[PDB]
Amino acid sequence: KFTAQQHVYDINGVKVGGQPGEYPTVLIGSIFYRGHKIVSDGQKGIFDKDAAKALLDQEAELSAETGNPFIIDVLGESVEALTKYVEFILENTTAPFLLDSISPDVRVGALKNLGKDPEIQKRLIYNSIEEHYTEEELAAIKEAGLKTAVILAFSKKALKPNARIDLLQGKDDKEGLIAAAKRAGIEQFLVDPGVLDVASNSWTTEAINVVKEQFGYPGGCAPSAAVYLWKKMRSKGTPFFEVAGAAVFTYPITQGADFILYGPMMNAPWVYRAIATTDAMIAYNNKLTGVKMGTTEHPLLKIF
């Protein structure tokens, strides 16, 4: 059980945060990622709409089965592509989503094209406020009137958990990422300390623990990239890769984390089954922790 009064956000019907066993893990699957074969042109954002819809339908079915809510990680390599992807997601699901690109210029460009829209303000989560943030980026977020952002403390200048907290809360001549998000008018913070590699997922998880301990903001991480770059384990094939992935993805949840970016949506069928299992065992512990479930839509009441 965490020290701070926990912040539970209601993002267009998706509950995220709280004490462990209060609300199920929110699962965040990636679509239109680099090399996603349903995309025929990554620059123009041309993709198989039926294949994309099938992924979204599968996510909704798995969510209905386990009770784990979903937010879609919408990735784009161009302003043109990401704008079209967001328009498609708005129309073809009711779920909230991450506006996601490695390029800040692509994120800001996309946001400018969407303008001032209450639906965007309710459903779009900015991924992310990170170490390279600019005043133009914060201004673009404020102009869009966004209220929820992923705060990413991924940095090779902040390896240890307490260094990642310094990045988040500020230190010396740096305001920190939370303060930067507040100046952009963000009021809801999904804190992601980043995953440098598989073994350091324990440090990611310690940073999540400190955030929930001191600030009470929802904590999560994105270990998919680290797992896919694990050549020795990925070489073994199915089901060895999946069970190793399951061990990495569930580890933060066992230590009280709130959400997981689990990588490509094609992996949802096994990720949901593994994460639902961990959630069920944690919630069964509620009597010992002094916690009450916040919803009847929980794996513990669904998967057995």
> Which residues sit at the interface with ligand THH, rule CB under 6 A?
30, 33-36, 73, 100, 127-128, 150, 152, 192, 194-195, 222, 224-225, 228, 261, 263-264
Q: Contact, 193 vs 210, CB < 8 A?
A: no
Q: Which is nearer to its own copies, 145 or 264 (CB)?
A: 264
Q: Are 212 and 236 in contact (CB under 8 A)?
A: no
Q: DSSP per residue over 26-68, as a string?
A: EEEEEES-TT-TTEEETTTTEE-HHHHHHHHHHHHHHHHHH--
Is 55 a binding residue for Na ion by CB under 5 A? The answer is: yes
| Number of C-beta neighbours around residue 217 at 10 A | 21
Based on CB atoms, which residue is closest to its own copies, 149 or 253?
253
Q: Edge-to-edge, what's the strand order for the sheet holding 259-264?
A: 188-192, 148-152, 124-129, 97-100, 70-75, 26-31, 259-264, 220-221
128: alpha, beta or left? (left if phi > 0; alpha if psi -120 to 50): beta
Contact segment (CB under 8 A) with its own copies among 88-96, 130-138, 142-150, 270-278 equals: 270-278
Closer to Na ion at the Cβ: 72 or 114? 72
Residue 176 CB, nearest approach to ligand THH (Å):
18
Taking CB under 8 A as the binding criterion, the range among 41-49, 133-141, 179-187, 276-284 that sits at the site for its own copies is 276-284
Using CA atoms, how far residue 239 sits from 21, 231, 265, in Å, is: 28, 15, 17
Contact 20, 252 (CB under 8 A): no
Strands (E), 135-251: 148-152, 188-192, 220-221
Cβ proximity to Na ion: between 221 and 265 the closer is 265
Closer to ligand THH by CB, 38 or 293: give it.
38
Q: In this chain, which of 77, 137, 166, 258 binds Na ion, going by CB under 5 A?
A: 258
Q: How far is the CB of 202 from its own copies (least distance, A)?
A: 4
Query: Judged by CB under 8 A, which of 83, 93, 128, 200 binds its own copies?
Result: 200
Q: Is residue 270 a contact point for its own copies (CB under 8 A)? A: yes
Residue 280 interacts with which of Na ion, its own copies, ligand THH, none, CB < 5 to 8 Å by class: its own copies
Helix or strand or coil: residue 156? coil
List of residues 6+ apart from 256 with CB closer than 8 A? 2, 19, 20, 208, 209, 212, 219, 282
**Identity at 293, one-letter amino acid code:** M
Shortest Cβ 107–ligand THH spacing (Å): 11
Q: Would you count residue 236 as binding its own copies (CB under 8 A)?
A: yes
Residue 192 beta carbon to ligand THH: minimum distance, rounded to whole angstroms: 4
Q: Among ligand THH, its own copies, Na ion, none, what does residue 174 contact (CB within 5–8 Å per kind)? A: none
Per-residue CA distances from 101 to 2, 79, 106, 162, 279 (Å): 32, 10, 6, 27, 30
Smallest distance from ligand THH to CB 290, Å? 28
Which residues form the interface with its own copies (CB under 8 A)? 160-161, 197-203, 205-206, 230, 232-233, 236, 238-240, 242-248, 250-251, 254-255, 269-271, 273-275, 277-278, 280-285, 288, 300, 303-304
Q: Which residues bind Na ion (CB under 5 A)?
A: 23, 55, 58-59, 258, 265, 268
